[PDB]
Amino acid sequence: SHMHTQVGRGLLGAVVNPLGEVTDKFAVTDNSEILYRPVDNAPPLYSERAAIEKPFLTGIKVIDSLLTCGEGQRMGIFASAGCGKTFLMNMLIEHSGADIYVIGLIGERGREVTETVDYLKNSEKKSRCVLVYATSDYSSVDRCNAAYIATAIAEFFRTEGHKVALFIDSLTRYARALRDVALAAGESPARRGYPVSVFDSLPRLLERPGKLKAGGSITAFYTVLLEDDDFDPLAEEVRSILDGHIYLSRNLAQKGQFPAIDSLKSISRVFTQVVDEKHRIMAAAFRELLSEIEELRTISQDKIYNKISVVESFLKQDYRLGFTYEQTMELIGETIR
Ligand SMILES: Nc1ncnc2c1ncn2[C@@H]1O[C@H](COP(=O)(O)OP(=O)(O)NP(=O)(O)O)[C@@H](O)[C@H]1O
Ligand SMILES: [Mg+2]
Ligand SMILES: [Mg+2]
Ligand SMILES: [Mg+2]
Ligand SMILES: [Mg+2]
Ligand SMILES: [Mg+2]
Ligand SMILES: [Mg+2]
Ligand SMILES: [Mg+2]
Ligand SMILES: [Mg+2]
Ligand SMILES: [Mg+2]
Ligand SMILES: [Mg+2]
Ligand SMILES: [Mg+2]
Ligand SMILES: [Mg+2]
Ligand SMILES: [Mg+2]
Ligand SMILES: [Mg+2]
Ligand SMILES: [Mg+2]
Ligand SMILES: [Mg+2]
């Protein structure tokens, strides 16, 4: 692919379609830097990467505490329908502290793209975001390119030295679109209706993020849309390529526990290397308390029972609230004492 796309501070505040034109704005920005960069870009050389050591603070208590992210990390978000994945995304943008946010919405309905644009228009981060989208009326090629364009905009901000958060919602529809392109090129379905080339191409896309020795980072969140145990190689491919997954539980969602993150089914694979030992001990104590609260949910013992409302109160977090690290750990501290 020879296609270049616009990059620069000029795009901050902009809503961009798969063809590169601006079709709405959620903020206007003084700078009008516009340059061009390729949408196909190799990931960094291993020699160019910095170790993930500094946390990417989300402002989300259950994550910052039990599933701490690292700057330069790739994190999966796995969710079935209506478990609040879009709100989680909005939260991760709002309550974090990145310099730049780049969002890529792939094959969503026009109503879904407008929720996000509506969200940005009302957010403090508006001056810091770029939104790229391909609504469901767009072709497979356009859905794919929307993901590349988004990544390429993040890449440019990273080379500038910035601390960038990339969001791709969803890889599921990205892979479906990539599949159709492959089928139309005459490729054969391998195992599930996907030709083998779409899974083979995934590492190249999903390894473009990361921390650079030279300065700057992309921390990336990729959503994977789950069916209710219906017929999911894509999820297991993504689980294996990223370094962590946040699982959204429908049980917790219907129950009202938002964000419906199931810590037992989630992991950050950089956890240990981005939090100190006091955090680790405190977090592991908290997980012990959790698994002890689940032993009760099978229907001293009464003491952990009284710890439930304070725990649930720790987990639950209205999408409009953000918590500092100190606030979150302060709260963890109280539930384990
Ligand atoms: N943290 C939260 N605080 C408050 N309300 C929440 C929260 N999370 C979810 N909700 C509620 O749940 C809905 C959020 O749905 P949404 O975030 O779009 O999930 P979704 O998985 O993206 N839906 P879909 O994309 O079509 O599968 C809203 O109608 C809210 O009322
Ligand atoms: Mg850029
Ligand atoms: Mg453009
Ligand atoms: Mg280094
Ligand atoms: Mg955990
Ligand atoms: Mg939604
Ligand atoms: Mg969103
Ligand atoms: Mg819809
Ligand atoms: Mg169209
Ligand atoms: Mg098509
Ligand atoms: Mg095969
Ligand atoms: Mg890295
Ligand atoms: Mg890893
Ligand atoms: Mg939430
Ligand atoms: Mg609340
Ligand atoms: Mg608060
Ligand atoms: Mg903080």
Residue numbers in the entry: -3 to -1, 84 to 311, 313 to 380, 393 to 430
Text of the article:
The T3SS is a specialized apparatus employed by many Gram-negative bacteria and symbionts to inject effector proteins into host cells. The T3SS ATPase utilizes energy from ATP hydrolysis to separate chaperone proteins from effector proteins, unfold effector proteins and eventually force them through the central channel of the secretion apparatus. Using a crystallographic approach, in the present study we reveal atomic details for ATP binding by the highly conserved T3SS ATPase Spa47 from Shigella flexneri. The ATPase domain exhibits an α/β Rossmann fold comprising a twisted plane of nine parallel β-strands that is sandwiched by seven α-helices on both sides.
In ITC experiments, ATPγS exhibited similar binding affinity to Spa47 as did ATP, but AMPPNP bound poorly to Spa47, with ~15-fold lower affinity. We performed crystal soaking experiments to determine the crystal structures of Spa47Δ1-83-ATPγS and Spa47Δ1-83-AMPPNP. In stark contrast, we observed much less electron density for AMPPNP at the P-loop. Indeed, only the triphosphate moiety could be located in the electron density map, and electron density for the sugar and adenosine base was poor. In the final refined model, the occupancy for AMPPNP is < 1.0. However, neither the electron density nor the occupancy of AMPPNP could be improved, even in the presence of 85 mM AMPPNP. However, when ATPγS accommodates the active site of Spa47Δ1-83, all solvent molecules are expelled except the catalytic magnesium and one ordered water molecule. However, this was not the case in the Spa47Δ1-83-AMPPNP structure; the ATP-binding site remained occupied by a number of solvent molecules, resembling the situation in the unliganded structure. Of these bonds, the hydrogen bond between NH of G162 and the oxygen between the β- and γ-phosphates of ATPγS (length = 2.5 Å, angle = 130.4°) plays a vital role in ATP recognition; when this oxygen was replaced by an NH group in AMPPNP, the hydrogen bond donated by G162 was not observed, and the loss of this hydrogen bond could explain the dramatic reduction in binding affinity for AMPPNP. By contrast, a similar movement of the side chains of F167 and F339 was not observed in the Spa47Δ1-83-AMPPNP structure, indicating that the base of AMPPNP did not fully occupy the ATP-binding pocket.
